[PDB]
Structure 1
Amino acid sequence: MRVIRVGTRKSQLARIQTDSVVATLKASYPGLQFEIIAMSFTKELEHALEKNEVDLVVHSLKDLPTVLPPGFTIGAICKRENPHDAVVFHPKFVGKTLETLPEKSVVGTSSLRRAAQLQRKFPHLEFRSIRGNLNTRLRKLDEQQEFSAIILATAGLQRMGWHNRVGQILHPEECMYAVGQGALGVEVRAKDQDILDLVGVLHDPETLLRCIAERAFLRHLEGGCSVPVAVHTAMKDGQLYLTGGVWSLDGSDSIQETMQATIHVPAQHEDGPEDDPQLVGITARNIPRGPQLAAQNLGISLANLLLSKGAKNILDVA
């Protein structure tokens, strides 16, 4: 291990996320060299990995499928940033909330998850698609009179240093977040033991266990980034709490349930067996396997409860 090559997309937010992970790595490894390789969507970065052109890539965890191709794996789940959804208001509406926008105000979001939940909670608002990156959406907000607000992840605006645009942070009772939102995943070659060990230092046990549950829930519902599925996780008092929900496209039909499981957060790293398979695409051999399997099982458990109440028919057309 000499120069650790980090591959990144050329987009602004992808670079910020990569730099943050590289800074954390450097703090654990001041004696190693890190190179950031920017290339001109996940299959192209996975190609560089497979061609040994880079050694690791940084993703928003919610953008990664629950099944990765067999030669790759998530070698690190970083300490979660703020997972909650946020509202940016049109300039004339600074200081308002969703509750106090005038009736028929148009709210911009291209997430089925966000639109379905907010339509349910706010019947008197209109939710409409809006395309573009964060800068483009904010430009269409401020330059035009079409949108009265847009919905975005709090974590994205924070990484841009634009927290001053956040006008409202949505509570779970208004809009539960996407599976993996606010956490970064580090993708690596599944068989590159040296690099898996290196990035393992980034694993945050609490976030790892929360995200295994969230992803196992999503996987067992056969969902991905695109579906109206939402979650809320918390680790308190030796319990892992997982809330999960599914919504019809307009939010009028929904199923939402909570489960918990006794799972203590590991406080120490351990030399785990190298022959255990990944869990929902994540490899964490330096973290005890017991709690990891238990988190996966909790997410499967909740998924089966939702399916028992009809979640599959909801998702099939949504």
Structure 2
Amino acid sequence: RVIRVGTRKSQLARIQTDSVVATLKASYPGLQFEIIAMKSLFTKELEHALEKNEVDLVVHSLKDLPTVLPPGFTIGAICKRENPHDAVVFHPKFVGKTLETLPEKSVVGTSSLRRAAQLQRKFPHLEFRSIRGNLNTRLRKLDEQQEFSAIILATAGLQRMGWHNRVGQILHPEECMYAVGQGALGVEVRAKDQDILDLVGVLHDPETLLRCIAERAFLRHLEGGCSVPVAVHTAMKDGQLYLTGGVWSLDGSDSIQETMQATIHVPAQHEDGPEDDPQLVGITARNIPRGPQLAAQNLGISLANLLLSKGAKNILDVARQLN
């Protein structure tokens, strides 16, 4: 009867879970949804819950899900993407500044290798430094202490907190391309639970799905391991899917970046697809035509092979061993 939704207890995970449950209740007003509250450790804890039929589905930020999931789990819904951009919050003394106009040697807080690599390259006169804590803690550090002049974070995190007004600068791709999956939510479920897969398949957004298949296929084929600097940009326009991807050394000084495109129509109709169909980069979308999904996957693989031909494996190897 009731659909059990497991969640981490942190505030942003609860907000994300609530928003997905709200969309499910809009399609299914006659159904009961119960929220059960209980990093890579907690991902496995939620997977255990799901393996043991303690919960039926779990909501993650998509960028937080590896491109290979354990067997028995799949991503049963890619929700419509929120804003994928990275953003800057400034120290309060910096009224109306941007990263371009901060004094030289200002310290910017980020614990993302990806952001730090791209931003050191774009802003060589700033210092980029690790900062610890959840979003409320980083904002306190910034408001109360003098170490940091600014911090970097995902716009969609602040947006979900109701704190969009804290944003002082939205970074564009030439400054900082986003992480694979950033801004999309993914729902993880048991790989062979057909009732729940049909249920959450109403959440799939076809454009976001194809974009993220391509972003994820690209990342998987690079085989860089976790936490190397890799970033993407995707757009669907005029029948084309565009994928830009890049890799960087930790200090940003070495980089390879290329763009490929493919003719991929965004499907507007749901279709009743076959059940034997294997998942693509951990995603199961049986109600969306399969052809465009495979084409999005092939685009990511292609762009990854191009980058590897131009030397990406050596950049990723060095970055991985120096993190």
TM over 0.5: yes
Alignment partner, residue 289 of structure 1: 290
**Quick one: percent identity of the two aligned structures?**
100
1-structure distance, mates of 2:316, 2:3: 41
Contact 2:20 2:59 in 1 (8 A): yes
2-structure distance, mates of 1:259, 1:272: 28
2-structure distance, mates of 1:82, 1:223: 26
2-structure distance, mates of 1:88, 1:224: 29
Contact 1:105 1:147 in 2 (8 A): yes
Contact 1:77 1:203 in 2 (8 A): yes
1:45-73 CA-to-partner distances (Å, cap 9, x unmatched) read 00000000000000000000000000100
SS at match of 1:207: helix
1:51-105 CA-to-partner distances (Å, cap 9, x unmatched) read 0000000000000000000010000000000000000000001310000000000
2-structure distance, mates of 1:190, 1:130: 37
1-structure distance, mates of 2:187, 2:295: 22
- Please report the TM-score for the alignment, with normalisation by the length of structure 2: 0.97
SS at match of 1:93: coil
1:267-287 CA-to-partner distances (Å, cap 9, x unmatched) read 000000100100000000000
Contact 2:240 2:263 in 1 (8 A): yes
Contact 1:279 1:296 in 2 (8 A): yes
| Structure 1 residues not aligned, in runs of 5+ | none
1-structure distance, mates of 2:98, 2:124: 14
**How many angstroms does 1:225 deviate by?**
5.3
1-structure distance, mates of 2:266, 2:242: 13
Contact 1:218 1:224 in 2 (8 A): no
**How many angstroms does 1:224 deviate by?**
5.4
1:259-316 CA-to-partner distances (Å, cap 9, x unmatched) read 0000000000000010010000000000000000000000000000000000000001
**How many angstroms does 1:227 deviate by?**
1.8
1-structure distance, mates of 2:308, 2:93: 44
1:109-157 CA-to-partner distances (Å, cap 9, x unmatched) read 0000000000000000000000111101111111100000000000000
Aligned length: 316
Contact 1:63 1:225 in 2 (8 A): no
- Please report the TM-score for the alignment, with normalisation by the length of structure 1: 0.99
SS at match of 2:93: helix
2-structure distance, mates of 1:158, 1:28: 24
Pairs within 5 Å for 1:124-273: 124-223=125-224, 226-273=227-274
Ranges of 4+ aligned residues in structure 1 off by more than 3 Å: none
2-structure distance, mates of 1:153, 1:71: 30
2-structure distance, mates of 1:305, 1:131: 36
1-structure distance, mates of 2:251, 2:5: 41
Q: CA RMSD in A?
A: 0.6
Pairs within 5 Å for 1:15-164: 15-39=14-38, 41-164=42-165
Alignment partner, residue 310 of structure 1: 311
2-structure distance, mates of 1:88, 1:94: 11
| Structure 2 residues not aligned, in runs of 5+ | none
Contact 1:21 1:58 in 2 (8 A): yes
2-structure distance, mates of 1:71, 1:240: 30
